[PDB]
């Protein structure tokens, strides 16, 4: 389908200060507004101003948030009941969502990163047992979600790590060194290195249930079926003022494990480069046929992933940096609820589109 989360803020949200990330609860039409207060707010998309939850606890600010979407029923059972966030206070804050439509209690507070934790991604692949995290320490860590343990640490980056994802048995991360690096969650064996940017990595993201992106760019580019079934896509928006559609199947961290190891461990693949505009991209939504991004320039953009053509620019949705978007995942039965985008930014506002 063509997802059209447009119209014009069905709900205008005036926030105490700025917003860093707004994402939808796995099952309910409520979102969690991650602010710089650091307060996490529970928010029914069809109501305002909601005092349901003003979860002050992120001592400094909310830098990361995950588990608001789920891909596996037995873990889902707890995922709709939990969330993993992280702050500038070096803690990875794991909470328990309850039937009250909010994170009633805290489950875990993880510490080991010393310079600011920049991003956390949960190993849903491990039934919500392992947690991937990264930070300004140039370091990537694995934690035990259900026990609060530091399970495994890796050193990939040369610079302060900016973003993170989970894919295969390896941990995806991007940083200020402009290079993406991916190491094996159990050993350090790599699954990607990307020297595909001039400037630092700002946003990474694995393809989901949307073969439309493969229809547009079948990958791998060399023998797609080599790993078409294993399409471990990723993307990497960066300070190049681009949104590059990436791939870890053939810029794999095989450190020349033959001579030129296929074409892995080099100048990163770059499936499709969406040349951006005059500012830095803050968020994206890989729709499949389309991509919905936003940037410091106050704009939200509809991109046609068929060559990466910005179909429409909405520079007036915010009056400050657009910090975040959340066009809810493809999912029939809730097409209108999924064709709904929430956003937040520098201007202390947040908006609900559809």
């Amino acid at each position: 389908l063509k997802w059209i989360p447009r119209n014009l803020p069905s709900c205008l949200i005036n926030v105490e200060s700025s917003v860093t990330s707004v994402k939808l609860h796995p099952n309910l039409p409520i979102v969690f507004v991650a602010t710089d207060h650091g307060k996490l707010y529970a928010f029914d998309l069809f109501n305002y101003t909601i005092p349901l939850a003003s979860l002050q606890s992120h001592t400094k600010a909310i830098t990361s948030m995950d588990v608001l979407f789920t891909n596996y029923t037995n873990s889902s059972k707890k995922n709709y009941l939990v969330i993993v966030t992280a702050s500038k206070d070096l803690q990875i804050h794991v909470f328990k969502w309850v039937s009250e439509e909010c994170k009633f209690q805290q489950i875990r507070s993880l510490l080991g990163h010393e310079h600011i934790v920049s991003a956390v991604k949960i190993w849903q692949k491990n039934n919500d047992v392992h947690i991937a995290s990264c930070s300004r320490d140039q370091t990537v860590k694995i934690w035990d979600f259900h026990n609060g343990w530091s399970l495994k640490t890796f050193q990939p980056h040369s610079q302060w790590v900016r973003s993170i994802d989970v894919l295969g048995d390896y941990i995806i991360s991007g940083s200020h060194d402009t290079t993406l690096r991916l190491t094996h969650w159990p050993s350090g064996n790599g699954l990607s290195v990307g020297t595909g940017h001039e400037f630092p990595i700002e946003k990474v993201k694995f393809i989901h249930f949307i073969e439309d992106s493969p229809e547009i760019r079948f990958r791998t580019p060399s023998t797609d079926r080599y790993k078409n079934w294993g399409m471990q896509y990723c993307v990497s928006a960066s300070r190049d003022r681009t949104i590059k559609i990436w791939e870890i199947p053939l810029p794999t961290l095989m450190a020349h494990r033959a001579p030129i190891p296929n074409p892995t461990d080099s100048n990163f693949r770059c499936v499709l480069t969406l040349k951006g505009h005059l500012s830095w991209v803050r968020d994206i939504s890989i729709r499949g046929q389309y991509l919905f991004s936003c940037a410091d320039d106050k704009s939200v953009r509809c991109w046609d992933l068929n060559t990466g053509q910005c179909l429409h620019v909405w520079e007036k949705l915010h009056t400050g940096f657009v910090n975040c978007l959340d066009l809810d995942v493809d999912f029939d039965s809730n097409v209108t609820p999924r064709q709904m985008m929430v956003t937040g930014g520098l201007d202390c506002k947040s908006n609900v589109f559809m």
């Binding site: 500038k88 010393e114 310079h115 300004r136 320490d137 410091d296 400050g320 940096f321 520098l346």
Partner: protein, 792 residues
Amino acid sequence: IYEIYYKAIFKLVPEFRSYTEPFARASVHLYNECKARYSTGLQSHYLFSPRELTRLVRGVYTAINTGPRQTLRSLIRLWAYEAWRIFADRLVGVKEKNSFEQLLYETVDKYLPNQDLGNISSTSLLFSGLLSLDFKEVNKTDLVNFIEERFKTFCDEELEVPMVIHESMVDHILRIDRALKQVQGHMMLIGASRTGKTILTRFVAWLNGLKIVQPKIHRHSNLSDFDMILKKAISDCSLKESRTCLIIDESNILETAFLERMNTLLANADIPDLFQGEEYDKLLNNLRNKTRSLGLLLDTEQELYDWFVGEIAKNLHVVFTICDPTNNKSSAMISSPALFNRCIINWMGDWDTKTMSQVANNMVDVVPMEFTDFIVPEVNKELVFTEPIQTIRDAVVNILIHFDRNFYQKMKVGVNPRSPGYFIDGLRALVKLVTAKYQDLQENQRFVNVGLEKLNESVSLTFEKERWLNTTKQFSKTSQELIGNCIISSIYETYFGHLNERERGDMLVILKRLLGKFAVKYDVNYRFIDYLVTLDEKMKWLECGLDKNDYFLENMSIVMNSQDAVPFLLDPSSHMITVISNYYGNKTVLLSFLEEGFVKRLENAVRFGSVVIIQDGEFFDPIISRLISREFNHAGNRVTVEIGDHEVDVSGDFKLFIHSCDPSGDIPIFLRSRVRLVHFVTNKESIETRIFDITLTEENAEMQRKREDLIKLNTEYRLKLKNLEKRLLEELNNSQGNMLENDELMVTLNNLKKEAMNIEKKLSESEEFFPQFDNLVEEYSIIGKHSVKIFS
């Protein structure tokens, strides 16, 4: 020649080719007009070289490379905005610039009269400082605000500074950005140090990600260490193939030989001996590996070394900053036309009064200058050249306009380059207090709010009502003069404690009668040296012998307990050697920050605890390194980024200031200008007092110390009243006139009946001792006053 330059341009934008030759002649005419009108005999910066015409074109031509289409207005916008961007910005004299604007204006009337001079030659507008040129423009005041927004992406242990970009400063900023675009964008910043300048070069380094290269050396060391730095810096340029950005403070020139190494670098992008012989060869080995990495044939020694200097050139962009050197280079280090015609020199110095209206504007917008019953603070005289003051922020604006204007001129301490970041430091001190003392005003109502929280229902008020009520309403009685006292402290924070009497007097003396015409109340004791220090603390200093008779040493009770920039603690008099070591006394030296850094000769000497400055006689070269001049301000390389605080963890009490005994001590020039010069001008009262101290050994020296202890003794009873407020927090809301029907009344004020007497006890003892001690010191003035004359 320039007809060729411009007819080329009008083949590129032939739609308005009709300008061609007269356009070229407007360029050359204005040039010769201004060359003749402003010769080098006026000043060297009026050296109108024919390559200034090429420079003029560089802005014009590179703009048409971005331009979408030309119009005659766009064309003259480009040219005449560029003309003052080049031909006027390259100059200093503002009246010469006013005539320049008219030479420009008239030049257009002479050759290109068809276009809009009114909105172009007469104003310093910028071509979209944050967008691609394209003959597009953006309001530069708005650009300041847009920068505020945009630098939030660099607001991370990088910028984060409570200072304002002057609208002339943003003109300077864009010019800097242009220089950054320039290959080998070498610069020379002339003017106010570390105040929208040195700070600004750091800003653009943070905003653009520029490698500030520093000469991390010491006078003990020599050119050899500079050579090492140059080897690793040039390795960054040519072997790592990365863009560097050497930042030079004119005080960095170790020696002429070093400067000569630099001169050849400037001439041929290389350094003799340093990158010759084996250094040449090991470079060729590394370089060919880098051109091999590039997949190029440049490996060939000759091409390789040419690549070395070519890669370096792309990666140099040396930004030099400067305050007039005393080594004859007050006439510019760039004495030669060879450097003059190649280095981008920013003749800034000071800023306009009009500019100060905009500086102050934003400076009063960024911080909470407004108040309640405070109406306005200026009584003296002068709202001239400005708008009549309608409120408090307006007052600061008017003030700044005439204040910075004359604070400072009168050539004693460099009449042409004043530093507004000091009025910002003064204002920042006003901000420290516009927040804190304002909050104290809320706390003040809170003091009587809290008292009120349990009056009526639980009181039998005597003194407590007197105190409660008097202070309740004194909060409004003090609604003017709180600022007047605060202003004076900011004057001293601005320049009284740094700038010499005449350069200072330029505003200071007249400020006493020319602050403005709109309210304030000064309040007799608006004295800076009392205003910012707690009596208990002041006594910790006086009890330790503080030379209070020297105004600027009495000041140390504040500065040592609250000073941002290093104070010049000159001690041949050993006034503060005596006092600092006494104040220190049983206190431990320095400790929070604990890592030895790079200067263990000082860190081993100071890392123990509470009070310390770079101690008695510890003169720069022997103790303080140029590494410290950097790390003193901040140091995330030792105070790990893991903490998050990239500033060195050093408190004021143990902040490493220097007890130099050399009046012309080795303070790095920017710090020499950014220093609280502490004056040890043993005042006549200090002369006779030090002599009193000698003569006090006759019998009663201890009486001096005893009274100081006793002054502090008087402060013991603040809690006899403050505890009442604490004990009057809850029952007001039950007030029914039954206050005598319960012991909530007596539990607090029956105690006051005796606590009030306690207030009198040790307090009065101190006072009984006071005159007794005074009569044992003053008696030596019979010869103390003689010693004053003897000292003269």
